[PDB]
Paper text:
The [name]-5 type [name] secretion system is a membrane-spanning protein complex key to the virulence of mycobacterial pathogens. Key to their pathogenicity is the secretion of a wide range of virulence proteins via type [name] secretion systems (T7SSs). The [name]-5 T7SS is found almost exclusively in slow growing, pathogenic mycobacteria and plays a key role in nutrient uptake and immune modulation during an infection. The importance of [name]-5 and other [name] secretion systems ([name]-1 to [name]-4) for the virulence of mycobacterial pathogens makes these membrane-spanning machineries a key target for the development of novel therapeutics.
We therefore generated two new maps imposing C6 symmetry for modeling these regions: a global map with a 3.4-Å resolution and a locally refined map of the cytosolic part of the protomeric units at 3.0-Å resolution. Because of the observed sixfold symmetry of the TM and cytosolic segments of the [name]-5 complex, we first defined its overall arrangement as consisting of six identical protomeric subcomplexes. Within each protomeric unit, [name] was observed to assume an elliptical ring-shaped dimer composed of 22 (11 per [name] monomer) TM helices (TMHs) forming the core of the protomer. We observed that one of the [name] molecules is proximal and the second one is distal to the central pore, and we annotated them as [name]-1 and [name]-2, respectively. We noted that the [name] ring-like arrangement is further supported by interactions at the cytoplasmic face formed by TMH6 and the elongated TMH7, connected by an extended loop. Because of the approximate twofold symmetry of each [name] dimer, TMH11 of [name]-2 was found most distal, and TMH11 of [name]-1 is the closest to the central pore. Both TMH11 helices displayed a distinct diagonal orientation with respect to the remaining EccD TMHs and the pore axis (see below). In our model, contacts between TMH11 from [name]-1 and the only [name] TMH establish a scaffold for the central pore. Besides these interactions at the interface between the membrane and the cytoplasm (membrane cytoplasm inset), we observed several specific electrostatic interactions of the [name] stalk domain with the N-terminal [name] helix, situated parallel to the membrane. In our structure, the DUF domain was the most distal rigid component at the cytosolic face of the [name]-5 complex.
Numbering used by the authors:
A (entry chain B): 12 to 74
B (entry chain D): 18 to 502
C (entry chain C): 13 to 36, 96 to 308, 318 to 417
D (entry chain E): 95 to 120, 140 to 167, 194 to 259, 288 to 332
E (entry chain X): 18 to 323, 339 to 457
The structure:
């Protein structure tokens, strides 16, 4: 049934897929996903945080 | 011979009789009263008796009498017709003034020229009590701020307790089945004096942790109110967002004694991250749960054909019960709950990001161009983000947030600085930028852009989204700290 | 009359994925999932349009008992002869419930094994097969020509409400020349509203009001011996007037005129479910909920044959008050054709 | 001004920022014509019983309505004239019956009524009932008795006055 | 037994009937239809017919159906009421099921809520540019208040003339839709920078000459846009009321050297006269024969329809609605004047401080008494609101500028108790 247990990669990526599809359904009332901007822009946030960490490591060395 | 069978209405009971279809009314109305009286005595009801002067005479349902010298068939009476047996003072009682009136506008216009219904009076009174208690709590908080004393804290507590008890008694259904509005308005309004009293309980000039505890108790009270009532999800959701941010900022203020600029910047980063997780959180809070996956069950065909919800008619009068589809009806209700939560998140994050960008004080010389550039990037962020939302009030919330960031930074520079150039630039952006928004709203839906240009305008969103984190770290001077510490 | 068309639609084949194997294409998979989900939605909207067609058909042919005040134009349009109208000549509405749609979901071929089956598409196809295999809130019907009798088991007012709805559906849809009705009761004051209905008129005996009303206070009181020289019935896999005999008398004299086989061309509705009439579980319509949920053995949608031998949800009964039945009866008494 | 409708008879209307319509009637009649002051959706401003003496004797009911108090009722009807025409016909058909006949005034005979009211003086009295019979007695060459009915606080309150010669 | 005379309506015809008050509705609904059909067929009008499947309902004119199993008396229908004879189509149909969580959420929100579209979008742009130019004009006024610079007045003038020309072009070219309110919003927004531009041309330190000039020109421009367009006439009525009072005060401080207290009291006297004068003055203003653009109610009456003939009812409806809008505007403007003058008078650091409190109490009672008089919802709501805000203003001023715990406690007590007393009623 349901309860705390163990799960595989294919299950977790499938869950993330359904989460993104529900997010698009909620925000935009469409469910066609030939392109999803949501992934693109959360990856832009990830790039922001990664660049922040990179420049954080860069300024540790010289002065 | 032919006979007609009709239902005589007399003394509020229905009596079926058989009547000659071809004799005149006045011939057969003499034994008919005897038959009706005999039936009434069988039923044990007070028999028909005349008073004054007049005749026994049969009227249709509207009251028009039958012609007494004509048979039933000559007056178009058929089987199963209902006739009222009455004693009338005169033989003439028609009302022949038929009148032409358009029924659509007649049944329409009455409800919107309606006078003041006392349910509206109760709602107005509850609203104005809400405004009054909010003004009282605000004045008590202002007195506690200006005049550090033990006086305002118990008085706000008493008012809060009495208002909440009154509101709960209203919501206790003893006085309110249909208008939860009164109870919700009073309940929401009474929470603010409670938070004011709790904050004023702590010593010091301010409420001792710079009023962490007031915002905290306000937030948790709103969370519990949603947990128990669940009606006004958007409003309490926005208030919970504001209270959560204020409590986090205040706890970092008293624990770490860090600068207010650092606090505003990290709260800004929190809202920036939170705008992207807002659809997910609205899904999660609404109770929408994506289906559990079969881990090891080999069976995949389930012919269980789930049963029917029988929605009993709310009158409870034995009416035929209707049927919804299944348990999955709650997907609808959780769906409007999710929309309400998401609208609340957008409003609250909008307020927080407007407040955080009011941390731009001095003119642009020196390092002050960096937070202004951060404001510009977040403006482009929010104004392009609105494509991702379809419902009008969410899109308006994002657009309004974007333009209010510019409005707030401009008014702060023109008020704090005494430079006429700053004033001219501020009034110039105030008049041009929403005018540009109006022109964009007028032109863009009515013209057909190149897919290339659509890709660039798609990419300004991402390109202004990216550089805001290093600018945030520049404003927090974490880079210089790592340079020196 | 609105038309419904059968279909046959094969379900899409779910995706497959190899499991990993120890140590001492996420976008492609998500695109395939999206394509599968769109195909599934296309099938769902096809199911919706077919279901709406079949809904319009049934509610054309079987209205709600309340809405029978419009008592002309479509009135008494059913025809005796064993073709065409035979598809609905004998059958009457009893409530609302589930039924299988006209689309037949073909079993998807090339199903991957249960370890290779991708979770999301497999679960979504599971759910599609579960929920789109029935149509919800459609009229549930009972055929008078397939059973010797039906029995109603439940509280008094529920059973009376269902019986009034049954009587009214027969009276509206079938003419007095095809269906005649009898009520045998111990409580005549609850059946006084049926004197208006033409179908209760006995043509043989005339009185002042017209044809004699066929309401009797006891089974012994029967002067309709003409309807009792028939044989035991052959079920309809048409006799000129089909007789419907309501009974709530609770009299041990029934089994004399009622064998185990019933009577040809007559159907009985045993109100007040008794051990005499409940001797066959497929003929028992048992009230379970207070709201009026009926449970009985499921039957085939096309042939009315019994499917399995355990009781299951059947319909939410159409309970119709005495006031509404009397209103319809006054409306119905106006007409002579 | 004249009006015709689905109804039976032509009704004369006079308008001067508000409408004036008279109903003639032909002893003691019921005092409760004020029940037709508040019809189903129309709200008449005043009902004046007018009776004049001299030998001739004439009696009229004159109707006052302001459309601005009746915008909801007028907006559903085909014209503002057809509203008060309908109310006039209702009151006329209500009175028409036992002994007294009633009919709405033609527009020319409205001015005839005005002329016969003019024909070329005492104070108002407050306690009204049963004094009307003794009020008609004193000698005159002409006399005009009038009683006004108005809606008031959801009810009807009555006032009257008379002039002689 | 009782019988209730009611007028039923069906198939654009109203018929007066005398229904039995105690027989249930289901008993009477059947023969009543036959009577109505007889009467309509006698008139040559097409009779009522049943379409498809459904049932007949007697309904109140507000729209709710009556209960078939109960008579008129149990469901509180009384003599003289109107009933509506509908044929309700049967709503009973299959229930769609969308088993997939995401698709179900998408279709349920898409079917039930309103998406954003260009019609709303242009209005949002107009609203926000209105807010922006109001902030800009108020900000230039703040700068000219703080500093003696002549240069803000050219900025205010140029932004005013640009927005006014744009508004005029939109009103002329795009008059074809009820989204011409985009032009109205812009013009209302742009009259304010014109007023502050004219006012800032008054030399020397800021004061009454700037005030009298600005409010005078703004009220005059309000009156012209009344006569030229006559669409947003309520809000212009409120604005011209406020400008009339402000211009009177400015001329009273320039032609004379009167104190503030005397002017506030005289304005209050004018307001209490004007609360009496308002319902007749609005009927005078109904007749001003400004150009006829119908507002929402009149528009949505005319969509359902085509001294005699329809021109008369059209004129009556337009006049009535204009009168309603004028009167509402007057009440709002008078409420603002009342609250600002009672705020101005009630200073606690005055030897005569007991008197304006008395005035506040009496006028509080007066407005609440007057609130019972008018039938429109928002008019009475406006009167009650300004009644609450006068005591709110005097309480907040007394607790703000006087640093005493006693007056603080008294104000915070009455500010919660007295609206609660209003809630009790």
């Amino acid at each position: 049934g349901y309860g705390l247990g163990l799960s595989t990669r294919t299950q977790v990526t499938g869950y993330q897929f359904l989460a993104r599809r529900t997010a698009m359904a909620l925000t935009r009332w469409r469910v066609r996903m030939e392109v999803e901007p949501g992934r693109r822009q959360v990856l832009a946030v990830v790039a922001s945080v990664s660049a922040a960490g990179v420049i954080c490591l860069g300024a540790l060395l010289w002065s | 011979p032919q006979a007609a069978v009709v239902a005589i209405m007399a003394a509020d009971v229905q009596i079926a009789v058989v009547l000659d279809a071809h004799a005149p009314i006045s011939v057969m109305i003499d034994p008919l009263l005897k038959v009706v009286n005999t039936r009434l005595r069988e039923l044990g009801v007070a028999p028909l008796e005349a008073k004054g002067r007049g005749r026994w005479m049969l009227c249709l349902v509207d009251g028009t009498p039958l012609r007494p010298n004509l048979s039933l068939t000559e007056q178009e009476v058929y089987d199963g017709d209902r006739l009222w047996l009455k004693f009338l003072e005169d033989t003439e009682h028609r009302s022949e003034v038929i009148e032409h009136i358009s029924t659509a506008v007649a049944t329409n216009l009455s409800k919107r020229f309606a006078p003041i219904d006392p349910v509206v009076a109760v709602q107005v009174g509850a609203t104005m009590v809400a405004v009054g208690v909010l003004l009282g709590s605000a004045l008590l908080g202002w007195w506690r701020w200006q005049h550090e004393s033990w006086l305002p804290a118990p008085f706000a507590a008493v008012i809060a307790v009495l208002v909440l008890t009154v509101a709960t008694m209203i919501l206790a259904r003893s006085k309110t089945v249909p208008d939860r509005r009164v109870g919700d308005i009073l309940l929401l309004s009474g929470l603010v004096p409670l938070a004011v009293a709790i904050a004023a309980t702590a010593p010091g000039p301010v409420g001792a942790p710079h009023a962490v505890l007031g915002f905290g108790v306000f937030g948790v009270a709103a969370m519990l109110v949603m947990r128990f009532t669940g009606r006004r999800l958007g409003v309490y959701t926005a208030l919970v967002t504001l209270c959560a941010a204020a409590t986090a900022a205040g706890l970092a203020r008293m624990v770490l004694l860090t600068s207010a600029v650092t606090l505003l910047t990290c709260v800004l980063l929190a809202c920036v991250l939170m705008y992207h997780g807002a659809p997910a959180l609205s899904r999660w809070l609404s109770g929408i749960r994506l289906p559990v996956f079969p881990s090891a069950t080999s069976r995949w065909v389930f012919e269980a054909r789930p049963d029917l919800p029988t929605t009993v008619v709310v009158s409870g009068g034995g009416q035929p019960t209707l049927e919804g589809p299944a348990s999955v009806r709650d997907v609808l209700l959780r769906a409007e709950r999710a929309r309400s939560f998401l609208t609340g998140l957008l409003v609250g994050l909008g307020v927080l990001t407007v407040v955080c960008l009011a941390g731009l004080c001095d003119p642009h010389a020196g390092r002050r161009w960096l937070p202004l550039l951060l404001a510009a990037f977040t403006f482009g962020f929010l104004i392009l983000r609105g494509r991702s939302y379809v419902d009008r009030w969410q899109a308006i919330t994002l657009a309004a947030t974007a333009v209010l960031i510019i409005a707030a930074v401009a008014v702060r520079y023109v008020l704090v600085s005494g430079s006429p150039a700053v004033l001219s630039a501020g009034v110039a952006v105030l008049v041009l930028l929403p005018a540009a928004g109006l022109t964009a709203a007028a032109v863009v839906p009515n013209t057909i852009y190149s897919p290339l240009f659509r890709k660039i305008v798609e990419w300004i969103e991402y390109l202004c989204l990216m550089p805001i984190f290093p600018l945030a770290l520049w404003l927090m001077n974490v880079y210089e700290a790592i340079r020196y510490r | 009359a609105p038309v419904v068309k059968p279909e046959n639609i094969v379900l899409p084949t779910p995706l497959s994925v190899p499991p990993p194997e120890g140590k001492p294409s996420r976008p492609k998979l998500d695109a395939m999932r999206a394509q599968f989900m769109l195909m599934l939605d296309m099938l769902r909207e096809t199911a919706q349009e077919s279901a709406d067609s079949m809904d319009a058909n049934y509610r054309w042919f079987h209205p709600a008992p309340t809405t029978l005040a419009a008592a002309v134009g479509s009135s008494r349009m059913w025809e005796r002869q064993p073709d065409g109208k035979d598809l609905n000549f004998g059958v009457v509405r009893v409530g609302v419930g589930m039924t299988r749609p006209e689309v037949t979901w073909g079993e998807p071929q090339n199903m991957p094994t249960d370890i290779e089956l991708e979770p999301v598409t497999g679960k979504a196809l599971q759910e599609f097969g579960r929920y789109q295999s029935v149509v919800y809130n459609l009229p549930k019907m009972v055929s008078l020509l397939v059973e010797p009798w039906y029995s109603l088991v439940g509280e008094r007012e529920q059973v009376l409400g269902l019986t009034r709805a049954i009587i009214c559906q027969l009276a509206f849809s079938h003419g007095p020349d095809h269906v005649q009705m009898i009520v045998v009761t111990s409580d005549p004051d609850r059946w006084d509203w049926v004197k208006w209905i033409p179908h209760f008129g006995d043509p043989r005996r005339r009185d002042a009001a017209g044809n004699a009303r066929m309401v009797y206070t006891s089974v012994r009181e029967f002067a309709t011996e003409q309807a009792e020289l028939f044989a035991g019935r052959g079920s309809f896999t048409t006799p000129t007037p089909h007789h419907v005999i309501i009974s709530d008398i609770e009299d041990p004299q029934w089994e004399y005129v009622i064998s185990s086989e019933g009577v040809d061309g007559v159907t009985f509705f045993d109100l007040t479910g008794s051990p005499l009439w409940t001797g066959a579980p497929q003929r028992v319509l048992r009230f379970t909920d207070s709201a009026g949920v009926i449970e009985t053995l499921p039957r085939d949608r096309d042939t009315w044959m019994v499917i399995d031998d355990n009781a299951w949800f059947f319909a939410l009964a159409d309970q119709m008050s005495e006031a509404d039945a009397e209103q319809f009866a006054h409306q119905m008494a106006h007409w002579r054709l | 001004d004249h009006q015709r409708r689905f109804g039976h008879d032509v009704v004369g209307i006079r308008e001067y920022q508000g409408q004036l319509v008279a109903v003639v009637t032909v002893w003691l009649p019921v005092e409760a014509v004020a029940a037709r002051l508040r019809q189903f959706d129309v709200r008449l401003d005043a009902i004046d019983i007018v009776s004049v003496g001299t030998d001739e004797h004439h009696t009229w009911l004159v109707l006052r309505m302001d459309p601005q108090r009746n915008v909801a009722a007028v907006a559903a009807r085909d014209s503002v004239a057809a509203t008060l025409a309908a109310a006039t016909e209702r009151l006329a058909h209500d009175l028409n019956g036992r002994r007294w006949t009633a009919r709405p005034l033609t527009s020319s005979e409205i001015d005839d009524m005005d002329a016969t009211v003019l024909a070329g003086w005492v104070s108002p009295r407050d306690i009204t009932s049963e004094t009307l019979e003794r009020l008609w007695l004193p000698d005159t060459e002409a006399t005009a008795v009038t009683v006004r009915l108005r809606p008031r606080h959801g009810g009807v309150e009555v006032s009257a006055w008379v002039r002689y010669h």
